Write a structure and sequence with these properties.
Disulfide bonds: 13-16, 13-226
Largest sheet: 4 strands, mixed
Structural class: alpha+beta
Strand order of the largest sheet: 2-1-5-6
Number of strands: 6
Protein name: FrnE protein
CATH class: Alpha Beta
Number of domains: 1
Domain DSBA-like thioredoxin: 4-206
Number of helices: 9
CATH topology: Glutaredoxin
Helix content: 40-55%
Distance between the termini: 20 Å
GO molecular function, one term: oxidoreductase activity
Strand content: 5-15%
InterPro entries: DSBA-like_thioredoxin_dom (IPR001853), Thioredoxin-like_sf (IPR036249)
Order of helices and strands: EHEEHHEHHHHHEEH
């Protein structure tokens, strides 16, 4: 009697924060919201990224998509305004272009304490709005503390690379599934929703899945059978 939602996401993707808000709006409108299980999965836009790339986000975007810095800025402006409608105040001018592998590990650590979503949320805010470097261990330990985790233990887990493999397995699974962009939603292990779609769309998917798991009872009409006990 549960609905599983698997979400692949990168901390470095502004559409993932937008998508998280839109999914949260859909969940709020969904009558059976208490039956929904959300599982975040690791995705790295660029697994081979430098620990910290010193350049401005605008310039990194320009290089990535081979567009003018003016066009890249227009893309940043678009995402900024779109995010504001979700109650997100982005500051792309402060963004630190960090490798997110360790941050994804922290989310895995947090999820074992049952705080995966809060850790994900904290990291998205730290990256998109607060100009924090999510590759930096001090920073990650601090964010873990703010979420209410054992900050000493979290940092120990990060330095040990305890969840490094769990993160790579997440990314492999996305690759196997053909997920090449984020956010990506999987509902009931069957349905896929690509990108940060409208709450109405995600609500529709939730509703469709619930409906399929709870079909109308048949009218039984009044010499044996094989039953599985």
């Amino acid at each position: 009697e549960k609905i599983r939602v698997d979400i692949w996401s990168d901390i470095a993707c502004p559409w993932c924060y937008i998508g998280k808000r839109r999914f949260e709006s859909a969940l709020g409108q969904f009558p059976q919201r208490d039956q929904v299980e959300v599982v975040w999965h690791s995705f790295e836009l660029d697994p081979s990224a430098r620990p910290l790339n010193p350049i401005a986000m605008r310039d990194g975007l320009a290089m990535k998509y081979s567009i003018s810095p003016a066009q890249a800025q227009g893309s940043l402006d678009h995402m900024t305004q779109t995010a504001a409608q979700e109650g997100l105040e982005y500051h792309f001018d402060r963004v630190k272009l960090a490798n997110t592998f360790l941050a994804h590990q922290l989310i895995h650590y947090a999820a074992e304490q049952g705080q995966g979503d809060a850790m994900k949320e904290r990291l998205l805010r730290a990256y998109m709005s607060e100009g924090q470097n999510v590759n930096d261990l001090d920073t990650l330990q601090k964010l873990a503390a703010e979420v209410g985790l054992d900050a000493g233990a979290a940092r120990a887990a990060l330095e040990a690379g305890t969840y490094a493999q769990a993160v790579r397995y997440d990314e492999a699974q996305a690759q196997q599934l053909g997920i090449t962009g984020v956010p990506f939603f999987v509902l009931g292990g069957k349905y896929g929703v690509s990108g940060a779609q409208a709450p109405e769309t995600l609500l529709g998917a939730l509703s469709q899945v619930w409906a399929e798991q709870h079909p109308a009872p048949l009218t039984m009409l009044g010499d044996g059978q094989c039953a599985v006990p």
